[PDB]
Design a binder for these strands. Structure first.
Lengths: 99, 79, 60, 155, 125, 127
RNA sequence: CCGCCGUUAGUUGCCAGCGGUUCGGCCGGGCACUCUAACGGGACUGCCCGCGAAAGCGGGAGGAAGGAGGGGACGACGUCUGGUCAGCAUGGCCCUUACGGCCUGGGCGACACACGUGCUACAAUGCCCACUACAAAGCGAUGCCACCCGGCAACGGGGAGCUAAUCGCAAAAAGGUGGGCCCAGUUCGGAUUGGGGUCUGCAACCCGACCCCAUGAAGCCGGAAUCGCUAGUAAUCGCGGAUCAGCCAUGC
């Protein structure tokens, strides 16, 4: 009965954490519907390199935003406990809802 | 061209309401060459601004009620 | 005159139609991506010099 | 071009009669993308043309093609200043290619109403030798043997 | 078989041939040809004077055309050039009214571009 | 019994179901001759059927999607060719130099930032 | 980035196989398939026929893929002492009871003209109507803005959802089905000109975009020249987005 939304940047860091969710949740909770991926939404933008005003010299940059999604069945004590005490994003962010 | 209710200028309002109540001078200067034309002034020499100086013009009849600054030339040299 | 233009639309002046953005680390409103309030060249200096999470030199 | 002799390249094997001539023609008529609009025009054509006569479309078509097949052309040549017109025997690839495209030119001229009739009329007249593009072809042949002098001075 | 201002189109779809005409486009056309009868398809070589007459009875007995529409505009313009509003000013000086771009363009209301002398091109290279 | 087949071409993916039967096709909701009444590449997409003359052996229900109708159609072709291979690899062997299992390299490729349509620059002045 | 295969996971989706079924996955049910994606694999002229002192060239098998796979990002030692102090920083030089602060008003929108670069046509491979298919890509709870009431609509009233694979922006278009035009400035075309308005915004005079009644200009394919480009490329086709209150955005 639990829904959780995950918005992270760096793929490698996020995925290992997104793994750490479902993995350790398969322990402290029962079955964890594995991270059904949501398309890497991207804030697209464009700019130039030289200040001496030309109509040339341009590069494209992407705000690459990774989405990950988690579903859980009927929860437990341990789940709440240990999976509310720790998290090490040092970056990435996590936002959850119990619909 | 404003759906309902037209747009004008209330400084000229306060001046004109006590200007009509008498019909005093011929000096209805305006450093506000914006407001649409409003016939409720019996048409006196709007000594309006010209971007550069206070250039006048009389308001009479046919001008049903159309904007101001288009009568203050402001543009120099003709062609 | 440059000091005024920045203090002008800083302390809220009248109608909404007079709210130009600003690269706060250079000082300009032109082509300032109003998501951050960073001009072209300066968004580029900050992004280039690495001080930005998830900012990627696109390879697509 | 320079280092390269370029290459050939396949023609869309006609999805009605399975020949390369057909699609080359089709692609000539094919404008601004829509290959099937113009192709439909030429197949409608072929049906009309094969109503008018007592023989199959590829027959009349090929006979017209032969009524073209421009065997000789005329290019440009340097002579330290002056211009030469080099009359050279083509590689049949360009023969048939601009045979189809000049066919298409003759069709460009044709004042007919709908396109189908233009193309049709063209294939008939050509197949007999009374065709615009065919006439043109023999005229450019006249160009080839008018500078018969230049046939001994090539680039 | 006439209407007003010696105007007769002759053999064509009616309303179209009518839209050919000054002071009235497709809208007014359909309007009349849908308030006072007549089907659009019918070509005119098969007509009858009745509906012709009463069509012309919706034409002039209602609005205005030709001789007026030009005269009205003319009066309005005489007003735009009575006090000399910027509009009428530019009516005189030979330019459009929008006040947009005339720096290089504006040859839809004042003849061909008679080149001054180019004013001599500098080293633009 | 379940001859499934895949077929991808030009921003479209064809989920081609081939079942045994009549060699008649009803695509995505409309008949083969009715859905595809416009481009003759329709029957061309049935080339594998005509390749082994199996336009009568094996029924079909199709779920091709994406791109434009044409790309969809060609993708379906790839699909039909791929359905028989899975259930009869004697058929892929006789269909390789025919060009049935070799794919593309196309899209309306990424736009250039110096030219209109990649190959289309601003015209050049000089002066 | 995209093309194939696989492991890895299904409130995207799916009768693929069953059921409810208002015969719309609409709902139980599943997640095989689609996609979405973390990570890998996979192809090197490895091999075969041949030629060559070799480099390697021609054919062939194989295979999702060939013998740089279709594209990127990357731009050397140094030049042109090109250029940007008005994007910035910054040295030097100059203004200071102002070259500064404040502001109202006008001005970069002006015009007898040269040119570039963009748009929209001069029709019958084409325009108008209904009819109905098949894209991706994105922005959106200081916002995106639907569904009903209105109206010709722009656009407004009630306002519904959407922190968003689940709601929305949003409707693709060429096409093609049925008809109508008939080679004529031609129902080709839409500049210009008048009057009716709605939105946005304090407010659209010099200075807006759009729905509408009226004209329907110039143009029936273009001198001397010059221009792009080898394939999903010319061409054609539509859109999102970004700066941005709205808005001249055909630009990019």
């Amino acid at each position: 009965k639990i829904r959780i939304k995950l918005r992270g940047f760096d793929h490698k860091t996020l995925d290992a954490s997104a793994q750490k969710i479902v993995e350790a949740a398969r322990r402290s909770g029962a079955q964890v519907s594995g991270p059904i991926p949501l398309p890497t939404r991207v804030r697209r933008f464009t700019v130039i390199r030289g200040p001496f005003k030309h109509k040339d010299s341009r590069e494209h940059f992407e705000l690459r935003t990774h989405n990950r999604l988690v579903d859980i069945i009927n929860p437990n004590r341990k789940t709440i406990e240990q999976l509310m005490t720790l998290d090490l994003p040092t970056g990435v962010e996590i936002e959850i809802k119990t619909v | 061209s404003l759906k309902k209710g037209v747009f004008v200028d209330d400084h000229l309002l306060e001046k004109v309401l006590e200007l009509n109540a008498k019909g005093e001078k011929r000096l209805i200067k305006t450093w506000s060459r914006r407001s649409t034309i409003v016939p409720e002034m019996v048409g006196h020499t709007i000594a309006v601004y010209n971007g550069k100086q206070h250039v006048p013009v009389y308001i009479t009849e046919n001008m049903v009620g159309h904007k101001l600054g288009e009568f203050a030339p402001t543009r120099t040299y003709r062609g | 005159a440059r000091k005024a233009l920045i203090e002008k639309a800083k302390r809220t002046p009248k109608f909404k139609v007079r709210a130009y953005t600003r690269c706060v680390r250079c000082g300009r409103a032109r082509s300032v991506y109003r998501f951050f309030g960073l001009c072209r060249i300066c968004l580029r200096e900050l992004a280039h010099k690495g001080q930005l999470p998830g900012v990627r030199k696109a390879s697509w | 071009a320079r280092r390269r002799r370029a290459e050939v390249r396949q023609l869309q094997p006609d999805l009605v009669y399975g020949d390369v001539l057909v699609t080359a023609f089709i692609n000539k008529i094919m404008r601004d993308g829509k290959k099937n609009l113009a192709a439909r025009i030429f197949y409608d054509a072929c049906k009309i043309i094969q109503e008018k006569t007592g023989q199959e479309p590829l027959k009349v078509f090929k006979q017209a093609v032969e009524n073209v097949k421009p065997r000789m052309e005329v290019r440009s040549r340097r002579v330290g200043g002056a211009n030469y017109q080099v009359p050279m025997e083509v590689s049949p690839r360009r023969q048939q290619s601009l045979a189809l495209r000049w066919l298409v030119q003759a069709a460009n001229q044709r004042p007919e109403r709908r396109a189908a009739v233009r193309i049709a009329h063209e294939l008939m007249d050509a197949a007999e030798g009374k065709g615009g593009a065919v006439k043109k072809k023999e005229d450019v042949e006249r160009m080839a043997e008018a500078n018969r002098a230049y046939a001994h001075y090539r680039w | 078989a006439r209407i007003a201002g010696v105007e007769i189109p002759r053999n064509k779809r009616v309303d179209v041939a009518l839209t050919y005409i000054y002071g009235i486009g497709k809208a007014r056309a359909k309007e009349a040809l849908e308030k006072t009868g007549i089907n659009p398809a019918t070509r005119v070589k098969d007509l009858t004077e009745a509906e012709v007459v009463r069509l012309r009875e919706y034409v002039e007995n209602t609005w205005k055309l030709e001789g007026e529409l030009r005269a009205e505009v003319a009066a309005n313009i005489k007003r735009l050039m009575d006090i000399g509003c910027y509009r009428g000013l530019r009516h005189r000086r030979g330019l459009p009214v929008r006040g947009q771009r005339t720096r290089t363009n504006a040859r839809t209301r004042k003849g061909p571009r008679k080149t001054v002398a180019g004013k001599k091109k500098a080293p633009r290279k | 019994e379940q001859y499934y087949g895949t077929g991808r071409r030009k921003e479209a993916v064809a989920r081609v179901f081939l079942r045994p039967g009549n060699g008649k096709v009803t695509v995505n909701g409309q008949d083969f001759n009715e859905y595809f009444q416009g481009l003759v590449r329709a029957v061309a997409a049935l080339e594998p059927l005509r390749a082994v003359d199996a336009l009568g052996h094996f029924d079909a229900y199709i779920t091709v999607r994406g791109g434009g109708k044409s790309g969809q159609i060609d993708a379906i072709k790839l699909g039909i060719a791929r359905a028989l291979v899975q259930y009869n690899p004697d058929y892929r062997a006789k269909l390789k130099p025919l060009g049935f299992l070799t794919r593309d390299a196309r899209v309306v490729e990424r736009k250039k930032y110096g030219k209109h349509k990649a190959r289309r620059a601003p015209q050049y002045s000089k002066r």
